[PDB]
Design a protein around this nucleic acid. Structure first.
Lengths: 67, 69
DNA sequence: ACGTGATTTATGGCG
DNA sequence: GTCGCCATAAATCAC
């Protein structure tokens, strides 16, 4: 079953996403060891986060056309 | 919470497409305009509906009777 | 407490 | 062979 991430893990991932929307193989290794998440989890988190960004911009675009 | 008419439209569509309750992007776009809601709101509704409807069979059967169109 | 709509982890297909 | 995008499942959040 799905494990919910800690307040600390989420915060740290969110901080790296702002700096970089895409991760390198090296940066993914660093964060996996620091946050105690597999490289797979870090990979999927960034993928889902990119999808979240596309969604949020679309919502704002919808509202900007409604005016 | 959505309007009684938006929920009505959504359930009528779901119960009449039970063999394939996966509306295409065009069907989601048409449902949203009809309900006065967003595509992502239609997307979330179908997702939640597909997993939840089958948790109480007796209730699903009563809605099929009621939402029959 | 639980129902509802939304959001957060996780998968498999495919380019 | 790997990774990103996509739609979706399943769990969980928030009121």
């Amino acid at each position: 079953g799905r494990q919910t991430y800690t307040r600390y893990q989420t915060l740290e991932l969110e901080k790296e996403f702002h700096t970089n929307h895409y991760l390198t193989r090296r940066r993914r290794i660093e964060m996996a060891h620091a946050l105690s998440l597999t490289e797979r989890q870090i990979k999927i988190w960034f993928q889902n986060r990119r999808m979240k960004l596309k969604k949020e911009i679309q919502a704002i675009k919808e509202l900007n056309e409604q005016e | 919470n959505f309007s009684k008419q938006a929920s009505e439209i959504l359930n009528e569509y779901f119960y009449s497409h039970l063999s394939n309750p996966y509306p295409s992007e065009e069907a989601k776009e048409e449902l949203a305009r009809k309900c006065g809601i967003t595509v992502s709101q239609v997307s979330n509704w179908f997702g939640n509906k597909r997993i939840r409807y089958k948790k109480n069979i007796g209730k699903a059967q009563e809605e099929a009777n009621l939402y029959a169109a």
